[PDB]
Design a binder for this molecule. Structure first.
Ligand SMILES: CC(=O)Nc1nnc(S(N)(=O)=O)s1
Ligand SMILES: [Zn+2]
Length: 257
């Protein structure tokens, strides 16, 4: 029954998921003045040319755009990754205001939203087996700031009215996640976890440097989603982000000087 309210939010997750106080928990604050530049980092490889979007779903915490991950259609190689990682779904973490909403923070700066493209390591068979492995997931973190309208997002924004409440799902085929990427693929990387329960410490996090801009009219329709199910009292789906967690014995490496 976890969520982001006052009585089931990120401050109560450790009572049902004691790994919330673990070692490699996410998100964290990316301190650009302590993030070491790693010249041995390879360029990222985003092969989304055969990505197959299937469905968009309101799961009571966010909205997920699921992809056909039965084959290596949309993968993520290069960077710090050893092997292939299939894009399975992406989602967003936003807030009620433009000064908050992102999960990762850059020098304590909060962005309006944060895009998470989730990939699972193919050598583990399926997603359920990869989440139990330290190098099982690779999530690509892309910040969203309020500004010009992002054209690659309008197809996502226009469909939100059909998935307003929890449990609603809608067809969402032929979507191209390449439009959601910024111009540059410079990134930070650090070993992390899921930012939602069960908070499994299985994620190699890749947070891109360059944010993307979205018009306030776009991010406003993110805030018109409902946490509740249909017929229940309306609770706006806002501030569905986890605050930053202690970095502890972890080093964030950057692909750019
Ligand atoms: C379906 C799936 O991949 N589960 C996720 N749970 N938390 C995720 S996140 N915020 O760390 O990207 S993805
Ligand atoms: Zn996420």
């Amino acid at each position: 029954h976890w969520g982001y309210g006052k009585h089931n939010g990120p401050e109560h997750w450790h009572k049902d998921f004691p790994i919330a106080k673990g070692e490699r928990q996410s998100p964290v604050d990316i301190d650009t003045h302590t993030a070491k530049y790693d010249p041995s980092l390879k360029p990222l490889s985003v092969s989304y040319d055969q990505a197959t979007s299937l469905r968009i779903l309101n799961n009571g915490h966010a909205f997920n755009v699921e992809f056909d991950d039965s084959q290596d259609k949309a993968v993520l190689k290069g960077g710090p990754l050893d092997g292939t990682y299939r894009l399975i779904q992406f989602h967003f973490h936003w807030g009620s205001l433009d000064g908050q909403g992102s999960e990762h923070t850059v020098d304590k700066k909060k962005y309006a939203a944060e895009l998470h493209l989730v990939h699972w390591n193919t050598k583990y068979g399926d997603f359920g087996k990869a989440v139990q492995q330290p190098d099982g997931l690779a999530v690509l973190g892309i910040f969203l700031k309020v500004g010009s309208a992002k054209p690659g997002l309008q197809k996502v924004v226009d469909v939100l009215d059909s998935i307003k409440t929890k449990g609603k799902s809608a067809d969402f085929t032929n979507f191209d996640p390449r439009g959601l990427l910024p111009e540059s693929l410079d990134y930070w990387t650090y070993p992390g976890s899921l930012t939602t329960p069960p908070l499994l410490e299985c994620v190699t996090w890749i947070v891109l440097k360059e944010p993307i801009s979205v018009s306030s009219e776009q991010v406003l329709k993110f805030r018109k989603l409902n946490f509740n199910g249909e017929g229940e009292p309306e609770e706006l789906m806002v501030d569905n982000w986890r605050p930053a967690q202690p970095l502890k014995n972890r080093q964030i490496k950057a692909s750019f000087k």
